[PDB]
């Protein structure tokens, strides 16, 4: 599922921008995040003792568009070869084909990037791939199919990608819409909207 409902009401409830429906009217003010302080008290009357990590667990899911059962499986595979769930977990999410199509700039949102992958428009090493959870490795070449290379939103997404922070671990050419992974993303750069004592005891908590 993709939730398919109104988006900005989620980011406002998390006091954090989730990049949902981002671009154009969503850059430079009028997103209104953390600007409604209420008429009396913090509206935490109450509220739940486990609210952290519980809302942080929805945040880290919703901000990549990743579902519980797959996120729990990421937390299990991330431990292999001494990978550490405090490091490899985030680098696996950033290494997704739907995030790589978003970081190469062909989608303005991770949803828009996913909707290029599933709609049979994306290739990895010349082979067509429709799996948004495909893990891109330090030798993979990612590109678009000829039927989609001239689409309006794809060209508009590249006009936003050049204003976004540069992902130094990859290469891309916009005239062919073809790029290559050169390094795995690293925690010394890869930084997220999550607190440092949270999601390090994920599940059973």
């Amino acid at each position: 599922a993709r939730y398919l409902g109104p988006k900005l009401k989620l980011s406002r409830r998390e006091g954090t921008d989730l990049f949902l429906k981002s671009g154009v009217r969503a850059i430079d003010t009028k997103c209104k995040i953390e600007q409604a302080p209420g008429q009396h008290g913090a509206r935490k009357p109450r509220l739940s003792d486990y609210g952290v990590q519980l809302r942080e667990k929805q945040k880290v899911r919703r901000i990549y568009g990743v579902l519980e059962r797959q996120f729990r499986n990421y937390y299990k595979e991330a431990a292999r070869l001494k990978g550490n769930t405090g490091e490899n977990l985030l680098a696996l999410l950033e290494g997704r084909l739907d995030n790589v199509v978003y970081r190469m700039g062909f989608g303005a949102t991770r949803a828009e990037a996913r909707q290029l992958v599933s709609h049979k428009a994306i290739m990895v090493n010349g082979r067509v791939v429709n799996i948004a959870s495909y893990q891109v490795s330090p030798n993979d070449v990612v590109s678009i199919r000829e039927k989609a290379k001239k689409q309006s939103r794809v060209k508009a997404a590249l006009e936003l990608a050049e204003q976004r922070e540069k992902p130094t671990w990859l290469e891309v050419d916009a005239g062919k819409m073809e790029g290559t992974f050169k390094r795995k993303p690293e925690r010394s750069d890869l930084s997220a909207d999550i607190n440092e004592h949270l999601i390090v005891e994920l599940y059973s908590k």
Binding site: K82, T85, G86, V200, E201
Partner: protein, 150 residues
């Protein structure tokens, strides 16, 4: 910097004529530095009163335990007041893990890489003591340098 932690705060009311009035019990650890662990109980009216009343007791007692690499040198069992605690070494990065009354003793000793479990009693005032008994059963060296001669 002196090492400290708050474990838990619980309502421990007073039975009175006509009903009940409300007080709080706090459980803390302090001691006399890292790996020099001291425990504190404190009950008061109000939460912050109980917490400080406990920490001023945790600054009267301490035990200096063998932890010469800041980590579990071997898997160990500890027991006190029906609470039984088992601890084994794990990998450092996300390795903490373990319930708050075991964890609090490990934090004031600088241990961040464990896998540990409670058995028998989960009464928090005693799980802390059983963890401090487990650290009494912890070791250091490499005893082939002391037992054998030379």
């Amino acid at each position: 910097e002196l090492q400290e932690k708050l474990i838990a705060v619980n309502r421990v009311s007073k039975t009175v004529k006509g009903g009940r009035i409300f007080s709080f019990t706090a459980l803390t650890v302090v001691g006399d530095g890292n790996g020099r662990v001291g425990f504190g109980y404190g009950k008061a009216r109000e939460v912050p009163a109980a917490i400080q009343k406990a920490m001023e007791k945790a600054r009267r007692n301490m035990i200096n335990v063998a932890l010469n690499n800041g980590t579990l040198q071997h898997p160990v069992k500890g027991v006190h007041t029906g609470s039984r605690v088992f601890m084994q070494p794990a990998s450092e990065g996300t390795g903490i893990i373990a319930g708050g009354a075991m964890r609090a003793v490990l934090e004031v000793a600088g241990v961040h890489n464990v896998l540990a479990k409670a058995y028998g009693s989960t009464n928090p005032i005693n799980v802390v003591r059983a963890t401090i008994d487990g650290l009494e059963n912890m070791n250091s060296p490499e005893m082939v340098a002391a037992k054998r001669g030379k």
